[PDB]
A paper describes a structure:
A protein involved in resistance against different pathogen groups, which is only present in monocot plants, is referred to as monocot chimeric jacalin (MCJ). As its name suggests, it is a fusion of two proteins, a jacalin-related lectin (JRL) and a dirigent protein (DIR) at the N-terminus. Therefore, the development of disease resistant plants is mandatory. It was shown that the rice (Oryza sativa) protein OsJAC1 enhances resistance against different bacterial and fungal plant pathogens in rice, barley, and wheat. Here, we report crystal structures for both individual domains and the complex of galactobiose with the DIR domain, which revealed a new carbohydrate binding motif for DIR proteins.
The JRL domain has a β-prism-I fold composed of three four-stranded antiparallel β-sheets. Two of these sheets are canonical Greek key motifs, whereas in the third case the very N- and C-terminal segments of the protein join to form the outer and inner pair of strands, respectively. The two dimeric assemblies of OsJAC1-JRL superpose with a root-mean-square (RMS) distance of 0.87 Å for Cα atoms and 1.24 Å for all non-hydrogen atoms (using residue range 160–306 in all subunits). The dimer itself features C2 symmetry with constituent chains being more similar in crystal form 1 of the OsJAC1-JRL domain (Cα RMS distance 0.58 Å) than in JRL-cf2 (Cα RMS distance 1.13 Å). As indicated by PISA analysis, the extensive interface involving both hydrophobic and polar interactions buries more than 800 Å2 of solvent-accessible surface area on either protomer and is classified as stable in solution. In contrast to all other mJRLs from plants, the two chains of the non-crystallographic dimer of OsJAC1-JRL are linked via a symmetric disulfide bond formed by a cysteine residue close to the N-terminus (Cys161). The possibility of disulfide bond formation for the JRL domain was already indicated in our previous work based on a shift in the thermal melting point upon oxidation. Overall, the intimate interaction between subunits suggests a physiologically relevant mode of dimerization; accordingly, the disulfide bond may not just represent an artefact of crystallization under non-reducing conditions but may actually occur in the full-length protein (see Discussion section). The increased hemagglutination activity of the OsJAC1-JRL domain under oxidizing conditions points to a crucial role of the intermolecular disulfide bond that is consistently observed in both crystal forms. Intriguingly, the hemagglutination activity of the separated JRL domain decreased up to 8-fold under reducing assay conditions (4 mM DTT). These observations suggest that, in contrast to full-length OsJAC1 and the DIR domain, the JRL domain relies on dimerization via the inter-subunit disulfide bond to achieve optimal hemagglutination activity.
Numbering used by the authors:
A (entry chain B): 157 to 306
B (entry chain A): 160 to 306
The structure:
């Protein structure tokens, strides 16, 4: 139905310009899973999506090698409604310090440490977050979203 | 057809009453706002997907210096950003800023508090607003239309 609609790219949030640019080269239509490595920090993000041609891809990891993973598997009627968190300085760079994933079914997080400036990306009504882009190094410097009608 | 993406709002989750538009927005024609201690009020005119034009607002209250923005025929709004914070017991939108594909308007208001931003990429366009308001503008979000 709405899976054919074009996606909207919005963001990123966090560091204005630090880190290696990370993005995807197909248009995401469905978010299948996220793997986030975390502890006291938000270490890396990965995610699997279906594109608008129905092909599956895994992006990431974007970030460094620390932390322990959580894998969030989207249920068949589960969609991502909001990403939120905090960002702030660490060792001379601005990093995402905490992150939180709010679906229509559950909240996963917060992961990392709730310190610095808050950010939030809420998709309303007929909108869901289907993929990410951003900048990273040892941690995640900035993150943005792709948003699709559902 | 395809619903327009709706993102936000940022600011108070509970103050004011909900403000929103009733049609699917396709093109943003103009914005009027007033600014002083905060973004006191906002209105905007948009074209919907049936070709009707609508003026939304004013959302907010009296006071402040007026600003009127009329978009060029091939000008579109790429980013809205601002701040929210406390004013006389309320959480309000303290400042707002607009970046089009041709120029920047703002910032308007007092850049105090928590920042927010909607940088619309890939030639998408911010085509309308929603939020919460009463005496002040307590929260704001946007509608984004992809190319």
């Amino acid at each position: 139905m709405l899976e054919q609609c074009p996606v909207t790219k919005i963001g990123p949030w966090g560091s204005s310009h630090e880190g290696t640019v990370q993005d995807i080269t197909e248009s995401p239509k469905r978010l299948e899973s996220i793997t986030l490595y975390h502890g006291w920090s938000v270490d890396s993000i990965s995610f699997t999506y279906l594109d608008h041609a129905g092909e599956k891809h895994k992006a990431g990891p974007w970030g460094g090698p620390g932390g322990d993973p959580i894998m969030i598997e989207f249920g068949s009627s589960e969609f991502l409604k909001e990403v939120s968190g905090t960002f702030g300085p660490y060792e001379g760079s601005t990093v995402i310090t905490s992150i939180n994933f709010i679906t229509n079914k559950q909240t996963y997080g917060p992961f990392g440490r709730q310190e610095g400036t808050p950010f939030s990306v809420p998709a309303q009504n007929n909108s869901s977050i289907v993929g990410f882009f951003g900048r990273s190094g040892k941690y995640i410097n900035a993150v943005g979203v792709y948003v699709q009608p559902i």
